[PDB]
Scaffold this active site. Sequence first.
Site, PDB file in Angstrom:
ATOM      1  N   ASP A 177       0.840  -1.201   0.000  1.00 44.57           N
ATOM      2  CA  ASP A 177       0.000   0.000   0.000  1.00 44.57           C
ATOM      3  C   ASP A 177       0.870   1.245   0.000  1.00 44.57           C
ATOM      4  OD1 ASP A 177      -1.905   1.890   0.276  1.00 44.57           O
ATOM      5  OD2 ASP A 177      -2.415   1.394   2.351  1.00 44.57           O
ATOM      6  N   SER A 180      -0.651  15.583 -12.036  1.00 43.23           N
ATOM      7  CA  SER A 180      -0.890  15.233 -13.424  1.00 43.23           C
ATOM      8  C   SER A 180      -1.127  16.494 -14.244  1.00 43.23           C
ATOM      9  CB  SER A 180      -2.103  14.269 -13.515  1.00 43.23           C
ATOM     10  OG  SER A 180      -2.519  14.029 -14.800  1.00 43.23           O
TER      11      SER A 180
END
Length: 330
Positions: A35, A199
């Site tokens: 994770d 992004s």
Amino acid sequence: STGSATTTPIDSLDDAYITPVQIGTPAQTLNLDFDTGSSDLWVFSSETTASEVDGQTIYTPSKSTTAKLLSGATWSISYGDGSSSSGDVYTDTVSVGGLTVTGQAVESAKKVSSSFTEDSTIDGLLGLAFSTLNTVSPTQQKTFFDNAKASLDSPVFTADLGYHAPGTYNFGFIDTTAYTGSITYTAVSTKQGFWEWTSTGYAVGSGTFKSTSIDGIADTGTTLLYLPATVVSAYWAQVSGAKSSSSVGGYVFPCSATLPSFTFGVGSARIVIPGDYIDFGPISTGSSSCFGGIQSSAGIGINIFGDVALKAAFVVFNGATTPTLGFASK
Ligand code: NA
């Protein structure tokens, strides 16, 4: 040193991935959920409340000649999905894919929430976010990666998740055979303890690319892609009959649909998520309503590039003094 381990989807939907991890001496092999959005290595154990264990493999520290209680240390964690676990702490030898760390903090669960009990395939979590998020008190502990780092050939790990197939976690090296083209690296903020990046925009299907900054985290422990409501609405508007359902808890779509791809930007590069990756199947067994793999992050307080996004790429988690992320097509 290096390590290399195969990661395997837990079910036909890729709801999560499990990776075998050797703990203790002699080894006890547990299947952990790696994770990159948390920083605790915790396991089902001989200490876990018996009614909260249903099929998981447990770690038994009393059977490990290298286990030592980390006296006075406790831990307690709550995840984004509302699940939780807590317990005490041992140090022990932990190996992943042939890479060994001695003295790793192994957080032994005394209590787990119902979602953990109900998932017999996940024996615990191995956190790969920054050690600043580790929950051990009163002495915060390091992640497996942070303890391995100085021994690694390169201070990196890579995630290469499969679509309905196994993939790979590598530690200490880049496998130049595992991706196509070049790797585009992008800046990381560690201020919230995550692999947080920005992004450069998105496209829906064959549509034009929209240049827009989307801050979010690279999180292997989250199944879906969670993005701003504007982006998500633009995606699902291209699917006839898709709608946001408050009763189901997100966007659903007709199981008869063919989904468009979704592209996200990494600098000037582009990662394309095929439409098929966005189908999470019937909302309930036999339903003709299917659950979407792109969902709104509104109310969650962060955008999350979970497994839907990451499994479309070869992802480099660069833990050099200034961390960075890399993405390549594959
Ligand atoms: Na669900």
